[PDB]
C-alpha cells in the first residue's frame, strides 16, 4: 500500500552523464556509444545570450575546443556537428556502459525521470509531467543543463528530455534529444511566455483510481455524468477536454476497481466544484495530475526493470 | 529555480540490490562485500507469521536452505546468522560493486531515499521521511520486503532502512541495517498501532526558507514571537516542540534569506491558525514536512555525488 511521486532508478543513466566544457561554459552531456550530446548554447559567452548565431558561433569551433570528461577521463572529441538545438560531440572511445537506449518525442501529459546534474556529476532525481503547455515545473539550478528525463522499459531507456532554459517565470523548457524544443521555446535570453497551463484530466482521474485502490474514497459519489457534460465543468477550470481515447486507457483501472470510468468522472466533477473541504486524498489537498494511467498501474502492480 | 522532493541517484544502491529465497518466500536482500542482508522473517511460512519463535525456526535452516541470485548469478552461502531482526548471509564473492557504506541508526525527523525493489530488481525511487512516531508513508507491495533507505555523502553511502512489514493501517515499519526496528514494532503479524503522528516542526520551517528563496512569500507576515509562544501553538497542532537546536539548525537558511527563525515561526503560527485559504506554497496546498534543512540547503545549492 501507500502512492507516492516514483522515480525510475537512475543508475543505467548516471552512467552516461558526462561534463562538457566549450571556452568557459560547462555543462553536463549525456555520452551514448561514441557520441556526445549535450545543448548547442555551450558555445555561448556572455554577449551571446541576448540572440545568438549559433550557426556562425560554431563556425569559430573546432574538435580540440569541446572538452569532454567522463568521472576524471578525458574523451578524445573526433568530431562534431549541430541538429536543431543539441551538439553532438563523436568521440574516440565507445560509452562501456551505454544502456539499451532509443530517442522518444513525448506526448504532453506523459511522464517521465529527471537525473538533475552538475558538471557531469548526479544531484538527484525526481519525476515530471511534461505539462500541456510543453513546459516542465523541475528543480534546476545553474549548471542543470543538458541534464535528462527518460523512462525506462524492462532493460531499456528512453531518453526524452534534454534540459535547456529556465524561462523568467521560473518553470523549464528543453528539447527531445534530436534536439527540437518541446513548445514554441527558443534557446536565447528572450522574453519567453508559456501559454495556459491546463489540468492533465486522464492523469487526475487515473490518481483518483490510485486511491480507490488504496482506501481513499470519501470522493465517490452518488451521481454519473457523460462526456460532453463533463468537458463542460472541464472547460470551466481549465481541464483539458476528455475523449474516449482517454476512457479506453483507463480501461484497465476501471475494471480492478469496479468503477465506470464516467462514475469517476462525476466524482471529478463534483471535487472541482465543490473543492476537497479541507480534506486530502493520498495525503494530498489539490487533485495531482502528474502520474499517468501506466504511472499507477505499476506503482500499484510491481513492475521492476 | 523549483522545489521537488528529490530522491539520491539511486545506482550505487541498484548494484547491490540481489534475491534471496528461502523456502517458498523470496524477498530482498543487500549484498555489501561478503554479506547479504535481509529480513529474518524469509524464514518465515503461513503457519510462522503469527507469532514466530525465529530461533527455533531458524535452527531448521542450513547454509544450502538460502538461495541467493544476484541478477542471474548464484551466490553460494557459506554462512548464515541472526543479528536481531536482519539476517546475514556469508556469501563466497565479495560484491564487485559494493560502495563505500556505512550503517546508520537515523533520528525521528530525517529523510532518505527507498529504492523499492521486488525479487531482487528496482523498480523505482522516492524520498522519505522517518515520522517522529518512526512510521514511514512509502508505497510497498507485497514482495517489497529488503528494500532498503539510504543517504549519499559525496562517494559514500549511508544505509539507514530496510523494509520490514506493512501495519494494518497501510503504514511502514522496518530496522536499521543491524536490524533493531525503528520504533516499537516487532517481525509479526499481530495488530500493531503507531502512535500519534505529530508533524516535523523545523522541516516545515526549512521548507517556508525554500518557498521564500523560490519567490512564494505570500505568507510572511507582519509578526514575530517567541519559543515558548510558538510552542503553545506547535501543541495544538501536534507538531513537534521547536528547540534552540533546531534554530541553530535553521541558521544557513535565515543567513541567506534574512529572515529571523523566530520571525518564520510566526508566520508558520499564522499559518496552523488561519490555514491556506485555498493558497499553496510550492505547488503544495499543505504544509510539507519532509524535507529537512539539510535537504533545502541541497536542492537550492546543487550539492552533486
Ligand atoms: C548555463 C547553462 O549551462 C544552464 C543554466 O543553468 N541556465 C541557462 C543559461 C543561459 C542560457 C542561454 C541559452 C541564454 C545561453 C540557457 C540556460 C540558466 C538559465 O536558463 N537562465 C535563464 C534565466 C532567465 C532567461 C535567461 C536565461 C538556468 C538556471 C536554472 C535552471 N535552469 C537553467
Ligand atoms: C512477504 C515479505 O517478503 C514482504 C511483504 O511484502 N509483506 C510482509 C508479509 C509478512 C510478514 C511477516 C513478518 C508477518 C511474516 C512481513 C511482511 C507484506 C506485509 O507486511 N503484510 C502485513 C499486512 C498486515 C499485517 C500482517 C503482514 C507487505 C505488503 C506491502 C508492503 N509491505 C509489506
Not at 6 to 15: D, L, N, Q, R, T
Not at 77 to 84: A, C, D, E, F, T
Not at 147 to 156: A, R
Not at 269 to 283: A, F, P, S, V, Y
Amino acid at each position: 500500500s501507500g502512492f507516492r511521486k516514483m522515480a525510475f532508478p537512475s543508475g543505467k543513466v548516471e552512467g552516461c552523464m558526462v561534463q562538457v566544457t566549450c571556452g568557459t561554459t560547462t555543462l553536463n552531456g549525456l555520452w551514448l556509444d561514441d557520441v556526445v550530446y549535450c545543448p548547442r548554447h555551450v558555445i555561448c559567452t556572455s554577449e551571446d545570450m541576448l540572440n545568438p548565431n549559433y550557426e556562425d558561433l560554431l563556425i569559430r569551433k573546432s574538435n580540440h575546443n569541446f572538452l569532454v570528461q567522463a568521472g576524471n577521463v578525458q574523451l578524445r572529441v573526433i568530431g562534431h556537428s549541430m541538429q536543431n538545438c543539441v551538439l553532438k560531440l563523436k568521440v574516440d572511445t565507445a560509452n562501456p556502459k551505454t544502456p539499451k537506449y532509443k530517442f522518444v518525442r513525448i506526448q504532453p501529459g506523459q511522464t517521465f525521470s529527471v537525473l538533475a546534474c552538475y558538471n557531469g556529476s548526479p544531484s538527484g532525481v525526481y519525476q515530471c509531467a511534461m505539462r500541456p503547455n510543453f513546459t516542465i515545473k523541475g528543480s534546476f539550478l545553474n549548471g542543470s543543463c543538458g541534464s535528462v528525463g527518460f523512462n525506462i522499459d524492462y532493460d531499456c531507456v528512453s531518453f526524452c528530455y534534454m534540459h535547456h532554459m529556465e524561462l523568467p517565470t521560473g518553470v523549464h523548457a528543453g528539447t527531445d534529444l534530436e534536439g527540437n524544443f518541446y513548445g514554441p521555446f527558443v534557446d536565447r535570453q528572450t522574453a519567453q511566455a508559456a501559454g495556459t497551463d491546463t489540468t492533465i484530466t486522464v492523469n487526475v482521474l487515473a490518481w483518483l483510481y490510485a486511491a480507490v485502490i488504496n482506501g481513499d474514497r470519501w470522493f465517490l459519489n452518488r451521481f454519473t455524468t457523460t462526456l460532453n457534460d463533463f468537458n463542460l465543468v472541464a472547460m470551466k477550470y481549465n481541464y483539458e477536454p476528455l475523449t474516449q481515447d482517454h476512457v479506453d486507457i483507463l480501461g484497465p483501472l476501471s475494471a480492478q476497481t469496479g468503477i465506470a470510468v464516467l462514475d469517476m468522472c462525476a466524482s471529478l466533477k463534483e471535487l472541482l466544484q465543490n473543492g476537497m473541504n479541507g480534506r486530502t486524498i493520498l495525503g494530498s489537498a489539490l487533485l495531482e495530475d502528474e502520474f499517468t494511467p501506466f504511472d499507477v498501474v505499476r506503482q500499484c502492480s510491481g513492475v521492476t526493470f
